[PDB]
Amino acid sequence: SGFRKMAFPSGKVEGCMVQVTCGTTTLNGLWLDDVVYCPRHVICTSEDMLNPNYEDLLIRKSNHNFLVQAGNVQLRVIGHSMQNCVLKLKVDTANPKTPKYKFVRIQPGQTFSVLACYNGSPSGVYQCAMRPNFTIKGSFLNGSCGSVGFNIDYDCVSFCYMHHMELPTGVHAGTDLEGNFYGPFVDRQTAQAAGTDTTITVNVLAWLYAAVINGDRWFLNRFTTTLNDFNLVAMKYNYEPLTQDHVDILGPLSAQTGIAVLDMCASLKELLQNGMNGRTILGSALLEDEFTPFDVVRQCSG
Amino acid sequence: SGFRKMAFPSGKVEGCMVQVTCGTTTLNGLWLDDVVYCPRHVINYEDLLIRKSNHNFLVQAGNVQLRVIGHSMQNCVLKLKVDTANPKTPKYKFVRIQPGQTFSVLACYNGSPSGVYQCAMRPNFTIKGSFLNGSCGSVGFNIDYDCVSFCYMHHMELPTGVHAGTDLEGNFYGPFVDRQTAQAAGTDTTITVNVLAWLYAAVINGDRWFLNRFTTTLNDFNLVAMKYNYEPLTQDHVDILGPLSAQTGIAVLDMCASLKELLQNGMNGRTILGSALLEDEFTPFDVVRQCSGVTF
């Protein structure tokens, strides 16, 4: 019993954190085998930030310009290439602590752990979700660039995010490990604003199922709804449209608890209309949306 | 910017998780040097342990089987002496924490770490954890510079879903015993110092709606706090909140008056750090370490 926002054990990722320095800029890198991955904006200066030509800036760099630091040991850069918004620094030493890994691009609503780093040194780990607006509500300070997002399913580390920047609203933008940004964001100082955020409906429904598994049934009701009537109500509360795909994903939880997906939808509709009324669901006074249907099954069953 | 429930990097502790099996029971152990620590319920514990031999305990570190060469019991923890010293043993200490103090929990099933979360020792000596069968032996810890401070070992779940465990010396937290009997967690209280610390972290992140021009006496605040089932705020707590009071420019008894109003009046459809409730599982140190970027 119990429900907590849980992150994956960060051990496998800690062994990959290195410090990457170029000129005045110092950020983190992900050392996997003989390649160190880091945001391409490490090559950037003060004036080469609003409109940087990264191809032109990287052509002026040599391998000895990049000081890569793994613990106390200084790694020697032997090559450098750029893939979209990440810099791939080829090094002369392969990381012995390299785990089994994959580079995966996640979709909005997906959750992942974040190992926050400062100067190639891990300071904390937290669980967070890719928001529907493609930003992450992280906890980052200056120097956190190159911190990574991951899911350690079974024994493989699935890298899904590298932190690149903070938007003016305190939310964060970053890329998959191939340098492709999540959202309409670019690595330029230009005015960029996060789109209007929405609540991840499928995750809220999964979290209601985890509450039912933990014996919290106060919010359940005798009503059901059509998928279209639910979405017409959900859109008014700034909730993500629940697709038929989401309904199918919630299938196992619906079977385990004995409450149909559309029945749990009507429960949510009533929760949106009435609120909590001094009550909590899983110790929370708000409808939590950073637990996917897969997270709920993992933490409640195995 | 941003505030999250953050746990310490679990890497140093992951290297210490082993699977301990004895008869039908299978749980986790903490392998530090040549000793594996695990709950004694894996086996009248003095009488039950005298009937055991070293080969009864199957200790498993990854795929490698460790051979037990001795066994002793220290309070509610079994100390299984093994032939091999853990090469992944970090610099560590066994520390007993006080209620209100927070720590990370590396949840494990069959000596295999599955998740890490941050939680606090409740004033009632229970932890609101996330545990299933097989996690007995999962440890609680804090990182101090490069040293792992082990402060908890999970033993059981109470009928309310809350957990009961011991320090790494086998001394239970709270009035709990490791036996099949009626045990209930005491009435819980909110950790006042941690709520105040969390209000300071909200101020650091630009959330100031709850602030007011008012201050209070420590005696008047504690009168109100006692009425709302909050832990008494000592002068020690006021001193601990000192750096945050200086950083934000809001006196500790000024922030107390904001909490006083938030308790009698509520939030009124508003949130503080994305939360509609007053969060109490961030200590004043956690707020400082997170809002200052301390690394390990």
Ligand SMILES: O=C(Nc1cncc2cnccc12)[C@@H]1CCNc2cc(Cl)c(Cl)cc21
């Ligand atoms: O955002 C950035 N860094 C940070 C990361 N995460 C959180 C923070 C919090 N407060 C300060 C800084 C932070 C950096 C530097 C500042 N400006 C900037 C601009 C661009 Cl176009 C890009 Cl790609 C990166 C940055």
Ligand SMILES: [Cl-]
């Ligand atoms: Cl995904």
